[model samples]
Target: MYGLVNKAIQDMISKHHGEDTWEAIKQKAGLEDIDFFVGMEAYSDDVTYHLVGAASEVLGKPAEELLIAFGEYWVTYTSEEGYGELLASAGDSLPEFMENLDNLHARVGLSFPQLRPPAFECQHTSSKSMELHYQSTRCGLAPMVLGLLHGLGKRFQTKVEVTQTAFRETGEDHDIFSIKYED
Candidate 1:
């Protein structure tokens, strides 16, 4: 994980819960010296997990829900971090974004080689429906996928409903989402 991820986590907390809550989460995570993380520096995955876990505990929210909310925040945060053009260039619509998602990650990897982001594949099943394939070595982030889809929908002014068609926990190789979108 890069420091950017943890920084986003912090920012998410700060934006929603307030600065005091963010500080509490950092202290609970044992990161009292917390400073904004550099975008290019890699940090331990455990550090990210600890902050999230602490946030979940402190905020009395489920870990998955917290992760999902963070995912939503990440959509806007990335744009605010000067990637708005890149994000806009990636897609003008939800499906269009889905089509370019892999390339977007690949392009990002050029600047952050340590980024091991998940791979995505989308299949258009109908005029308004698609199958989104999400594969990652990381655990328990299916809800984040849902949030990202919803966030993308908002970003593109598309209405979307998503259902988890396959769960990695059920011995599936990867999670699959059936997404239906409307203009």
Candidate 2:
């Protein structure tokens, strides 16, 4: 993952939990030596995993919960972090944004050449329903995807219902989500 991710985690924690808690989490994660993260730099995947584990312990919340919250925050975070124009270029509607997600990441890849972005494919079943196929090199982020969908729902001012029809962690080929939206 990139330092932007860690910085976002830090930002999310500090914004919601106060600087003291953020400091505690960093300490618990054995990252006290690092004063700040460089948004463009690459970081070890373990750094994020460790921070999540430490945050879970420090905040007494489940890792999945934190990931979901982080995912939701990510929508707003990226927009505020100078990606607003890029995000706006993606779409004004949820379905449109989902369809353009790959292209969006491809654009982002130009800035972060080492990015290993997840792949998303939408299979629209109806005017307001779709089957979302998610394939990622990472693991244990399905819950985050759920939160991202919810965030997009809020962003588009749509009522959304998402049900996981398949799980990659459970030996399925990939994660599939049955999504229904009301605009």
Candidate 3:
């Protein structure tokens, strides 16, 4: 993971909770020594995992729930942090953005050379629905993907219903989503 991710977590916590809470989370995560994160720097995956675990404990919320919230916040965060043009280049609608997700990551890869992005395959079943196959090198992030879809729905002003058909954590091959959308 990159420090950008940790930074976003920090920002999310600070904005929603408070600076004091964010500091407490950092301390609980055993990262009190670190005052800031460098956006482009690489960090151990454990750092993020530990932060989430600590945040879950501090906030009295499930890790998955926090992840979902974080995932939703990511959409707004990136745009506010100057990735709005990049996001715009991806698509103008939910379905279109979903279809171009991989390309968007590919474009992001130019800057983050070590990125191991998730793979998405959209099997459009009709004009309004699709089966989204999500494969990622990381674990326990399917919830985040769920929130991301919801975020996209909000961004595109589309009604959306997403149901997870298969769970990778349950020993399935990969995460699968049944997605239906309307403008």
Best candidate, lDDT: 2
- Please write out the lDDT profile of model 1 over residues 67-126, one tens digit for every residue: 888877889999998688889899798898998988998888888987898999988999
Would you give me the overall lDDT of model 1?
Answer: 0.88
- TM-scores for candidates 1 onward, in order: 0.96, 0.98, 0.98
Query: Local error of candidate 2 at 157, Å?
Result: 0.9
Model 1 stretches with alpha carbons more than 4 Å out: none
TM-score of 2: 0.98
1-183 in candidate 2: lDDT tens per residue? 999999999999999989999999999999988999999999999999999999999999999999999988999999999899999999999999999999999999999999999999999999899999999998899999999998888999999999999999889999999999998
RMSD of each: 1.1, 0.8, 0.7
Kindly indicate the candidate among 1 and 2 with the higher lDDT.
2
True-structure lDDT of candidate 2: 0.95
